[PDB]
Design a binder for this molecule. Sequence first.
Ligand SMILES: [Cl-]
Ligand SMILES: [Cl-]
Ligand SMILES: [Cl-]
Ligand SMILES: [Cl-]
Ligand SMILES: [Cl-]
Ligand SMILES: [Cl-]
Ligand SMILES: [Cl-]
Ligand SMILES: [Mg+2]
Ligand SMILES: [Mg+2]
Ligand SMILES: [Mg+2]
Ligand SMILES: [Mg+2]
Ligand SMILES: [Mg+2]
Ligand SMILES: [Mg+2]
Ligand SMILES: [Mg+2]
Ligand SMILES: [Mg+2]
Ligand SMILES: [Mg+2]
Ligand SMILES: [Mg+2]
Ligand SMILES: [Mg+2]
Ligand SMILES: [Mg+2]
Ligand SMILES: [Mg+2]
Ligand code: NA
Ligand code: NA
Ligand code: NA
Ligand code: NA
Ligand code: NA
Ligand code: NA
Ligand code: NA
Ligand code: NA
Ligand code: NA
Ligand code: NA
Ligand code: NA
Ligand code: NA
Ligand code: NA
Ligand code: NA
Ligand code: NA
Ligand SMILES: [Sr+2]
Ligand SMILES: [Sr+2]
Ligand SMILES: [Sr+2]
Ligand SMILES: [Sr+2]
Ligand SMILES: [Sr+2]
Ligand SMILES: [Sr+2]
Ligand SMILES: [Sr+2]
Ligand SMILES: [Sr+2]
Ligand SMILES: [Sr+2]
Ligand SMILES: [Sr+2]
Ligand SMILES: [Sr+2]
Ligand SMILES: [Sr+2]
Ligand SMILES: [Sr+2]
Ligand SMILES: [Sr+2]
Lengths: 49, 142, 142, 150
Amino acid sequence: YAGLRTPAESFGSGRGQAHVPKLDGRARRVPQAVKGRSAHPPKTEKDRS
Amino acid sequence: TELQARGLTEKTPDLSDEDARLLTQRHRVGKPQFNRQDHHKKKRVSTSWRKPRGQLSKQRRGIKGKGDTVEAGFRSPTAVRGKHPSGFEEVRVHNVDDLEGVDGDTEAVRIASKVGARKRERIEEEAEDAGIRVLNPTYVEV
Amino acid sequence: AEFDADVIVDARDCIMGRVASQVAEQALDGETVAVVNAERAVITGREEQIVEKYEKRVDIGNDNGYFYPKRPDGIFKRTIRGMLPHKKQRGREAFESVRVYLGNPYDEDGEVLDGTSLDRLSNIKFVTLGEISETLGANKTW
Amino acid sequence: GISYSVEADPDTTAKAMLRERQMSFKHSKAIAREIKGKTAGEAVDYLEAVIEGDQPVPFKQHNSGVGHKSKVDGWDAGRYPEKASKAFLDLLENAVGNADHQGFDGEAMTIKHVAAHKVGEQQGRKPRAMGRASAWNSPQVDVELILEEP
RNA sequence: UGUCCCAACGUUGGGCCCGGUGAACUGUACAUUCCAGUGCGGAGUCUGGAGACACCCAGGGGGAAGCGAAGACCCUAUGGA
RNA sequence: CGCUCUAAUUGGAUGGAAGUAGGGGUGAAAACUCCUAUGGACCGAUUAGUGACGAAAAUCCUGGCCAUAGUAGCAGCGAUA
RNA sequence: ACCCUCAGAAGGGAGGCGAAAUAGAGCAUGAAAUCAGUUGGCGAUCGAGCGACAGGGCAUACAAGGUCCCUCGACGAAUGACCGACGCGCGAGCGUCCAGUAAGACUCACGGGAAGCCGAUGUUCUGUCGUACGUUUUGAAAAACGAGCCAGGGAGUGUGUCU
Ligand SMILES: [Cl-]
Ligand SMILES: [Cl-]
Ligand SMILES: [Cl-]
Ligand SMILES: [Cl-]
Ligand SMILES: [Cl-]
Ligand SMILES: [Cl-]
Ligand SMILES: [Cl-]
Ligand SMILES: [Mg+2]
Ligand SMILES: [Mg+2]
Ligand SMILES: [Mg+2]
Ligand SMILES: [Mg+2]
Ligand SMILES: [Mg+2]
Ligand SMILES: [Mg+2]
Ligand SMILES: [Mg+2]
Ligand SMILES: [Mg+2]
Ligand SMILES: [Mg+2]
Ligand SMILES: [Mg+2]
Ligand SMILES: [Mg+2]
Ligand SMILES: [Mg+2]
Ligand SMILES: [Mg+2]
Ligand code: NA
Ligand code: NA
Ligand code: NA
Ligand code: NA
Ligand code: NA
Ligand code: NA
Ligand code: NA
Ligand code: NA
Ligand code: NA
Ligand code: NA
Ligand code: NA
Ligand code: NA
Ligand code: NA
Ligand code: NA
Ligand code: NA
Ligand SMILES: [Sr+2]
Ligand SMILES: [Sr+2]
Ligand SMILES: [Sr+2]
Ligand SMILES: [Sr+2]
Ligand SMILES: [Sr+2]
Ligand SMILES: [Sr+2]
Ligand SMILES: [Sr+2]
Ligand SMILES: [Sr+2]
Ligand SMILES: [Sr+2]
Ligand SMILES: [Sr+2]
Ligand SMILES: [Sr+2]
Ligand SMILES: [Sr+2]
Ligand SMILES: [Sr+2]
Ligand SMILES: [Sr+2]
């Protein structure tokens, strides 16, 4: 759930901004965002044997 | 009173006629800079080569003036590829034992930068005695 | 005010464009040329049509400007400029090594360049630079 | 802050610095530029005349909208930055003082080196229409001066 | 009855110059342009010419198909309400 | 070709490691390497592995910063001080 | 610490400590964007994808590159003469012989020279070519879309099954 604990939402078109989820004027959740989730991180379910 | 470099600093290798010819060719022909397209137009774009991939890329389409594109045709002669400009083949050395098996008539040694002054001094005197030139010699006042 | 010309050309009864062409060629080769008796230089064709062309050039213009010469002096100098890359270093150097004069300011007579002479006994359809200038409204100072 | 950016022979030189001064950096560049090469004493008389309004300071780079001044030489735009001038007078007072404490003839020494450097901005905020606020900052300026025997 | 013919003079606050304070919009790059042409047919940047010594102040806004908003109109989506 | 960490084999470093700056050499190239200055403690190579492994771009994200600019505003309100 | 300066527990100067204060308080290192000062190159008559490749100017401590230039000679691919002689053409000019000769890129040897001198690096000038990049598109320099600049961040991953 790292990076997913936020209700951040995108403003969409209209304010001359990229459609990036933001919260309190701060971008979040998405992989390109600082403090956002890891896109394809290490996973516990992976069989390493 | 003056600085002098340790070792066989002026030594030259003995190359076949064909090798001297090819070494001379490599040096005469040279090659383009092969820097990345438009590296000079934007500071965030370094010089490190990257194949131009733009569909409309002028350099990619081979437009005269946009710079040469890396191709196998630019490779240097096998017989000389990699030689130090002197003609010597280089051998990387980290200690005195690395000097063993080195032919001072055909190879010159380059002491890794990490090596300290104490170990370098030993490597340098042993190399000279083995008739081996050291490309990056220590300069001492004599 | 004293022009050390290596060559003095006499444009009297000579086809303007042909002289201009040979003079530009010489100036590019490093020759300092003085063209003399410009008012007597000649241009072939029907006077009424030739005049219309020069009048149109005088009428053209705007804020950026299209300052076209009216004196035979300048008409000829401009004709030569159009045969020189006057905006390039070597071109401006050549152009500035050429000067055109009304009458002959030198003591020497000018030479008549080969192939530029017009034979009045064989031609009636031509006009004089001086005639064009007067028509254009110039002050016949010659 | 800065460190002297130029070498100085302690036996024939005296130094001084201003730190984080809250004044126009653009004005400081103009004043430094103008007094360099002058004698400390000349610099002082010049700055007092600037403050008095008798001598304008040439504004050669930060001159947008600046009206021309007839007394400006070889240039058109100039002004009378009194605040930064007074800061430079403090600097000169410090320099000449240090100079005299060392046995030198302070006022007679030449301003060998003098340069202003922006070390930061004191941040501020100003409320604006439509529910937004924008920056309203103060420049922070360091300035180095090196006096040298004639 | 200055809405108009047809505009004038004046008043107060700005504007302009000086001290102090001191933002924002906007910025691919280059950029002194003009006339024509060309080009995805609406070019400061391509071609041909013309013009063009650098910088600065004030101005009214012709152009940058100016800035500000992933066109509201129209169509399309095995979209929504 | 380059990056991380693991293992085996094998090396470097306070007689100055990594990094950074400027500079020399090699390779078609990814990139490798040396010199000098700074730095002041870690750093490789080969082989077999491991992968949160390579950016110029997404009106991309965060931080820092320049031009804009000593420019706009610090006048306008029946309370001109 | 002490001293000097200053309106001054400020700041500055000088000084003391330490291997180091360019370790002096968000105080290990200290990139880029970028700013001040300054060195080199260019610069107030001149033109715009900012360069690539050639070639000139000026600039250059050492180290890590050491080459380079001119006479002459040797070798000498494709190509390839002048002149002279003879013969054709209205003429521009051509043919035959001299002759596949002289010449001919590179490379080398002898003799002489260069050490800012050769390479290289910075900048600038000349020549040739040249309207970014990525994307959308039949067609992009585009008056189609994106970005102010830089650094860092930023996109084929796991389980199960199948081939
Ligand atoms: Cl290969
Ligand atoms: Cl005109
Ligand atoms: Cl031209
Ligand atoms: Cl006739
Ligand atoms: Cl500022
Ligand atoms: Cl050869
Ligand atoms: Cl893939
Ligand atoms: Mg995270
Ligand atoms: Mg770049
Ligand atoms: Mg103004
Ligand atoms: Mg409100
Ligand atoms: Mg509009
Ligand atoms: Mg839309
Ligand atoms: Mg509708
Ligand atoms: Mg519905
Ligand atoms: Mg091994
Ligand atoms: Mg990265
Ligand atoms: Mg890409
Ligand atoms: Mg403005
Ligand atoms: Mg620090
Ligand atoms: Na939360
Ligand atoms: Na598992
Ligand atoms: Na004619
Ligand atoms: Na005209
Ligand atoms: Na200026
Ligand atoms: Na003046
Ligand atoms: Na004046
Ligand atoms: Na009225
Ligand atoms: Na306008
Ligand atoms: Na944006
Ligand atoms: Na050069
Ligand atoms: Na697109
Ligand atoms: Na494009
Ligand atoms: Na277009
Ligand atoms: Na901005
Ligand atoms: Sr909308
Ligand atoms: Sr080292
Ligand atoms: Sr000719
Ligand atoms: Sr300015
Ligand atoms: Sr206005
Ligand atoms: Sr720096
Ligand atoms: Sr990644
Ligand atoms: Sr700013
Ligand atoms: Sr008031
Ligand atoms: Sr108001
Ligand atoms: Sr001290
Ligand atoms: Sr043009
Ligand atoms: Sr031959
Ligand atoms: Sr970045």
